[PDB]
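Q: Predict the assembly, please.
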Amino acid sequence: LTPEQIIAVDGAHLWHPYSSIGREAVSPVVAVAAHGAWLTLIRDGQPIEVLDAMSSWWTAIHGHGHPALDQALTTQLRVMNHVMFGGLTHEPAARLAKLLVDITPAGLDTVFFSDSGSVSVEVAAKMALQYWRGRGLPGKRRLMTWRGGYHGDTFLAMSICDPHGGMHSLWTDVLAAQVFAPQVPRDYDPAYSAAFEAQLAQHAGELAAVVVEPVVQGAGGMRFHDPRYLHDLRDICRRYEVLLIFDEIATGFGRTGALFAADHAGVSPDIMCVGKALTGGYLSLAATLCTADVAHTISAGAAGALMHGPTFMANPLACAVSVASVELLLGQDWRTRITELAAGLTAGLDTARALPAVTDVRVCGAIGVIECDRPVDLAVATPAALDRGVWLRPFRNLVYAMPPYICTPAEITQITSAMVEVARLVGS
Amino acid sequence: GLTPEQIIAVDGAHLWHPYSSIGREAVSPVVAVAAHGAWLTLIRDGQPIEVLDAMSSWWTAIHGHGHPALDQALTTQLRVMNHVMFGGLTHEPAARLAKLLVDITPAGLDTVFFSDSGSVSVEVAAKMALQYWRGRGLPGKRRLMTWRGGYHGDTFLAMSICDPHGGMHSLWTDVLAAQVFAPQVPRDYDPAYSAAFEAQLAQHAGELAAVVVEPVVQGAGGMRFHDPRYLHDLRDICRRYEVLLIFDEIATGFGRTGALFAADHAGVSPDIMCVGKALTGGYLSLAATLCTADVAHTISAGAAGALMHGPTFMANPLACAVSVASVELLLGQDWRTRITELAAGLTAGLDTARALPAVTDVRVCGAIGVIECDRPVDLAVATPAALDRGVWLRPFRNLVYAMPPYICTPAEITQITSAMVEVARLVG
Ligand SMILES: Cc1ncc(COP(=O)(O)O)c(C/N=N/C(=O)c2nc3ccccc3s2)c1O
Ligand SMILES: Cc1ncc(COP(=O)(O)O)c(C/N=N/C(=O)c2nc3ccccc3s2)c1O
Ligand SMILES: [Cl-]
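A: Predicted assembly structure:
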């Protein structure tokens, strides 16, 4: 198909994320290639090279078409595409589980593979519910979180999305009613943790788990909070016997400057979700990890098993590329790489602070954010960024980037320059 | 790298399996080291042995594993573009696949929402149905209706429409949405069943968004078949009472029941349809939810303005690319004759099981063969007996069953059926 033909088919038959059919303000742009940190897009019938500043929604940590990941895939493809995980096991699943259990916060000893982040969140909730049922306490079945969060689009996942301002707001009426603490602030305030404890205390007998994104809240507003809050959550959850779940689907694999965001606080959750960058952005895969204690309690319960099992569970292809992606990350000095990236983003975005429409500029590891004083118009922002050789996808009032770790200093500055110019257009 | 013994050690300590325990498994999983065509290479007492994939790795491996055309499609796409975000971008694999799916599915299904698993595709279908009625100013239409015996996945919404017994709803007291269940649909056509279904629907019509069913064949919930005329009745009932009809063809799709889609046996189109499993030829997790122009426009013209769903890896180029190849390979051969031959092979091979003491039913529908027993099939007895005969079989409850790859030769079908008959013989 030609780019024109692709556009015609797409307009007629393809639903896009959080979109309409036939009522799109803009057509999507045709992507024809991706190599390293660069995408080849079609603009006015002509191919153009642009930087993947979003890492394809925080997935492409090693860039696209990395030789190590490409070959990990083709090697596995030669041997075994897929087998059912019921009654069978395999090397890619075992290699990946071993890696994950070793590199995640201490105590996370068991791994349940699934095919997406949302599902891995549903699995985490199921683990928590079955845990308490295994303890003879089925009343512990609600979840508690703080505002500003996002955990996916399946119905249970939706129930812990930010209620007033989050994308799932119109659905309250049919969702499970969960417990919400106020928005966690950026700076550490002991009063916030005290209020969190007081609220949790009154629901403790009906709460299975606290579920949060640690340090960085992604899709709910690219907000950062002091890691000390995670220390407080761990303590509160311990004392009130509520499980603690960290959703690291966006924060995992070095993105915030530590291997996992929980590491900023030295905290171990009882249950943890990973996804996105897990596969280096080649294929959909996610994982839910839990402690031996959680695993044993579920396994000793009336169910005698965790009642979940997706068709493509532990897909060899996805696992094999993930093994390669994780090994590639661990085999380099990733901490220095992310520190250099963060410094690059900080230096490059500094000028944005002075712009009339900019309310905040913030950086955390390989995450750069310009917060504007109004919703960003994509019809203006998209071409402006493309004009400067960068693919940016603002959302709400945020112009932000989570670049591939392989971006050179020059490429980071190109990205931040495009961000600043988008922000300039917002205010003019 | 890990040896089979090392794999078992890692797996026992760290890996969850579908609907399994950690540390309380009756039998260790068997190490799978390769898969090619209709055959898996498994480790039995340290030795690699080749056995037939009688289940098609749970419906998925329709062209067998490592089909050269499907391998080549994946590697071709890998050299061009592994993945890009589907927010603001489109691409050829998504367009090519959407075009194919619209063309081959029951008439009227004009739009395609890609997701990363069957459960997610079912949640998307439910979301379409609920948002549809919100767009019609009828938000009270929020419940789902189904018949007993069904299975639609493991996420919390999907669980709510699973058979209450198969889905162990007794373990989920007041966590699941309470849906409307009709009695088990019978094998033979009885107008009284449909009249009763209609009367039950009628009294719930004002609070029902949709009827959701698996058409012709109920898979994971009991491998039951029903007369296609029941689907004709559902279409009519849903039409007259203004309730949407959703067919879940995640297991039945792509020729498995002897028609391209099971709905084709009835000459009916649903308002919303789910596909998965065989979609990718079993290479990778991908699913799709299709809906009519009416459904898509009613959602889009609603005050909400957008379907609030969008998985990170939506419309993954690699998965879409191998699916395009899998669909084209199916359509480019005389698949109808192939399935007819497979059905005949299964019928002939399983015929001797009818006379066995512990056998209550023997049934075949397209490339699906089932022996139902009068008691639970003992896995510790069933596995070695099938493995001796060069066949991987996975009985559950009282059922010994197969859904073989379409590429299976008459000799392989004879091998598969003989193993099934022997498992049934040992039950009695
Ligand atoms: C912390 C966290 N937990 C779970 C999920 C859901 O994972 P998944 O999409 O694989 O089901 C996610 C999903 N992340 N979503 C995205 O990064 C975005 N999707 C869109 C779509 C449209 C506009 C912006 C975004 S950000 C997540 O960040
Ligand atoms: C009609 C239909 N709709 C939706 C789903 C859910 O798809 P997914 O597992 O990709 O989320 C499915 C999933 N089917 N699952 C399987 O056939 C099996 N899963 C397991 C798990 C453990 C042991 C046996 C089986 S069979 C389905 O058949
Ligand atoms: Cl978007």
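The longest strand of chain B covers residues 30-36. The domain at 1-66+334-428 of chain B is CATH 3.90.1150.10 (Aspartate Aminotransferase, domain 1).
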